[PDB]
Amino acid sequence: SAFITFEGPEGSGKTTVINEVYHRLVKDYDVIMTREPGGVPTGEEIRKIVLEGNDMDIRTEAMLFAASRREHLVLKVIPALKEGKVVLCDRYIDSSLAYQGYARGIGVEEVRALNEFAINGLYPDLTIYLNVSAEVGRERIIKNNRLDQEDLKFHEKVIEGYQEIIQRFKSVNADQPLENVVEDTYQTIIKYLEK
Amino acid sequence: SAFITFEGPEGSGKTTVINEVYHRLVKDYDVIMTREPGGVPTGEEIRKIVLEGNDMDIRTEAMLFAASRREHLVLKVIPALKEGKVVLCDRYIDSSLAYQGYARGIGVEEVRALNEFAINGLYPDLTIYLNVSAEVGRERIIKNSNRLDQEDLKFHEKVIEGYQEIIHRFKSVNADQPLENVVEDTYQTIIKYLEK
Ligand SMILES: Cc1cn([C@H]2C[C@H](O)[C@@H](COP(=O)(O)O)O2)c(=O)[nH]c1=O
Ligand SMILES: Cc1cn([C@H]2C[C@H](O)[C@@H](COP(=O)(O)O)O2)c(=O)[nH]c1=O
Ligand SMILES: Cc1cn([C@H]2C[C@H](O)[C@@H](COP(=O)(O)O)O2)c(=O)[nH]c1=O
Ligand SMILES: [Cl-]
Ligand SMILES: [Cl-]
Ligand SMILES: [Cl-]
Ligand SMILES: [Cl-]
Ligand SMILES: [Cl-]
- Kindly identify which residue of chain A lies nearest to residue B52, measuring between CA atoms: A42
Please tell me the distance from the alpha carbon of residue A49 to that of residue A179, in angstroms, as a whole number.
38
Please tell me the distance from the alpha carbon of residue A153 to that of residue A5, in angstroms, as a whole number.
26
Q: How many Cβ atoms from other residues are within 10 Å of residue B152's Cβ?
A: 13
Burial letters B154-187, b for 16+ CB under 10 A, else e = ebbbbbbebbeebbeebbbbebbeeeeebbbbbb
Helix (H, G, I), strand (E, B) or coil at A144: coil
Please tell me the distance from the alpha carbon of residue B90 to that of residue B125, in angstroms, as a whole number.
14
Ligand 6 centroid to B77 CA: how many Å?
Answer: 10
Residues with beta carbon inside 6 Å of ligand 2? A 10, 14-15, 36, 91, 95-96, 99-100
Q: What domains does chain A contain, in order, with CATH numbers?
A: 1-195 (3.40.50.300)
Q: Is B12 annotated as a binding residue?
A: yes
Distance (Å) from the alpha carbon of A99 to chain B's nearest alpha carbon = 16
Q: In a 10 Å sphere around its CB, with 0-12 CB exposed, 13-18 middle and 19+ buried, how is residue A49 labelled? A: buried
Helix (H, G, I), strand (E, B) or coil at A172: strand
What are the counts of helices (DSSP H) followed by strands (DSSP E) for chain B? 9, 5
Q: Which of B36, B40, B42 to mutate to test the interface with A (most CBs of A within 10 A)?
A: B42
